[PDB]
Amino acid sequence: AEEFPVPNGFESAYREVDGVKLHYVKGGQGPLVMLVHGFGQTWYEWHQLMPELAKRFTVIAPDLPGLGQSEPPKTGYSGEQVAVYLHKLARQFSPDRPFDLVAHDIGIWNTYPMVVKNQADIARLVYMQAPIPDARIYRFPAFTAQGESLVWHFSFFAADDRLAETLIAGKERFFLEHFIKSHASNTEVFSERLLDLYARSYAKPHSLNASFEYYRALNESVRQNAELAKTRLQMPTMTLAGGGHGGMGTFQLEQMKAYAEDVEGHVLPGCGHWLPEECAAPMNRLVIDFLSR
């Protein structure tokens, strides 16, 4: 039983990595591109980009540990720990060539450490819509003159007593719908069917918990990255951010400038956080052209 419909020409599969059974969807031929989803979602957020990319690349899109159909990590949820699973997964399919990496939201947190520690293995990098965990995250405001702020959820999700699981259980669809729309400029793309699919997936008790464990490990990730960041990224990099409600705006590129020597960035006016869904065509085009260089 697949939680989400698989694109024609792709296969849903599993690989054990360090004793953890990871789910992924894979298709295409050529050099490998790994696409890593973020909070609230699964591999399925890439389902529109995948077939287009699969024309020139082997494409793989894993479920993060504990989310979608992937087992929880056996080590833990910090960036460095999760990054190991993702790196070894990619290397199973691209042992002899560097691969490309595209990530969204916490997908960034869970890939950065392996990128910086295995630079020769990464051909090109695309990061979208979330800060790399560092001191900058401590500057975002708790509240704004227009209402709720962008990242107050860091504190809600990091809170102990299983605060988030406990408040959200039984109200999973309701919460996710509000979270998506509060970080979207274009809410229309999210049909009740699509909301249904995402809600049922992260509503799995172990997945609901996994969702927040990534946040409970966020400060540890930050401390991890304070060390890792003494080494700059040397591969070609692109950042993408929404310019509308829910978007990171100029922040995404400006932060990346501190990490990467070779980087370009785009802000998409009229788009929020959920780039692959809110602004699929232009996001798809920028990514494809960047990787096809």
Added chain:
Amino acid sequence: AEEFPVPNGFESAYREVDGVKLHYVKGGQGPLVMLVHGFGQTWYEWHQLMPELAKRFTVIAPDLPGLGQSEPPKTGYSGEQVAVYLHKLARQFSPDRPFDLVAHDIGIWNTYPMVVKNQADIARLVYMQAPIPDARIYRFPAFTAQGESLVWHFSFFAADDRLAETLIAGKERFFLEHFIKSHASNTEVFSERLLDLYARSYAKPHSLNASFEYYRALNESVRQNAELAKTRLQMPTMTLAGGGHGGMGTFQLEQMKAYAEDVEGHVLPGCGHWLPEECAAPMNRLVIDFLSRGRHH
């Protein structure tokens, strides 16, 4: 019926003010002091302080509109709208003389506008544990490196779609214990028994909703205060803040210096947000001594 036990010698009563029935507890003799509670609680937070103050003052402790046993406001939940009810209540009992004011948390929000607009009515003022709504509240962090973000709940509580009530309904007791203890230094004072009392009160549907309406009105209150603050407070004021986990620390005094000409501040070590309960002895002492500088019974 009473949600919380009245101290010996005090009465639980109600007064209709602009069509809104406010609950209060009152006792003592002499100059009036009004004590105004904050979010998560009711008049009851003052219950250990009240008998002490009542030896020198007439003490009144109202429930904020919609909270405790007080009806919701008919006008709205912004600072200025709510302050009218409390000002008028106080003046019912002290029509011919200024009165003293002690406020905690959103009690501050709900009193500042009547204080600044009726300075002659206010003899002395004590504020503790929350910023006055102004531009400073937009500078608090959403997430911190060490400990926990103090006011991320502003966004939670103010969010659309009745986000907070919808998630918290049926889980009021769980949530309140978390909120209180996560904002406390001395968590041991929050016994399961006391927590049951507070949770039963704010779990009344209209109280749960009212709790969050104060936050939905927060930006409005900030706008109101931008105008009101063009005039500084001239009466003696004191601020208190906890120095431990959940405490505002030096922020309390530093912000107040922008609002008041005559202000002294204290930060209480090893105490968090809930001063009257976590640090009753030194907090009560500070308040009694400060109010007793002015004339009393």
